[PDB]
Amino acid sequence: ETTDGVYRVMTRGSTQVGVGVMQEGVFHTMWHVTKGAALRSGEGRLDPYWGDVKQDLVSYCGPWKLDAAWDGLSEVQLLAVPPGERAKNIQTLPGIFKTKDGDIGAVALDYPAGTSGSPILDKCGRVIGLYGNGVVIKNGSYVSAITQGKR
C-alpha cells in the first residue's frame, strides 16, 4: 500500500539502505538510496516517476509532493529512522549552506548511511526536506542539507 508515513527502504538477510516519506500517494526518497529502482510495497510495486541526480531526489508513483520550506528561523526536527533502531525525533536549530545559488538550511546531526532519506519536520509536522546529502567538516562530523524538491 501507500499509506502516509515514514518507511524504511530495505534490500534482501536484509539491509536498510535508506528511508523515505509516503504522502499523497507518492513515495519520496533520496536518489542515492534507490538509484530509481522499483520498490516492493507489500504485494505491490512502486515505479519511479521523477528524479534528479543533482538534487539527489526521486519520487515514485507521481510527482514530488513535499513543498513545505524551512522558515530560515525556527528549530526543526529530524525524524531519524536509523537501521535497526526505532524512529526518533531530534530537535535542532539548522545552520546554513551558503551557495552561489542561495542558502539552504542544514542540520549538524550524524547518523549511519542507511538513515538517508529521513524526513526533517517543521513545528506543524510538515516535511521541509530529507536528510542525507551533506558535507564532512574538519572535526569529522557531518552536516546535512535540508534537501527539498519542487512540487
Binding site: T11, R86, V135
Partner: protein
C-alpha cells in the same frame, strides 16, 4: 535484488524533544552529480 519498503512510523512533531546540535554557517558548492563540497 528485492528492494522493498516497510512502515516505520507516523510523521509527527514531538513535544518537549531533545534539542541538540550546533548551527554551522558554511560556504558550499554543489556539483552536477549531487555532491556537496566546502569552499576553501
Amino acid at each position: 535484488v528485492d528492494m522493498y519498503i516497510e512502515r516505520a512510523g507516523d510523521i509527527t512533531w514531538e513535544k518537549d524533544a531533545e534539542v541538540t546540535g550546533n548551527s554551522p554557517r558554511l560556504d558550499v558548492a554543489l556539483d552536477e552529480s549531487g555532491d556537496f563540497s566546502l569552499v576553501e
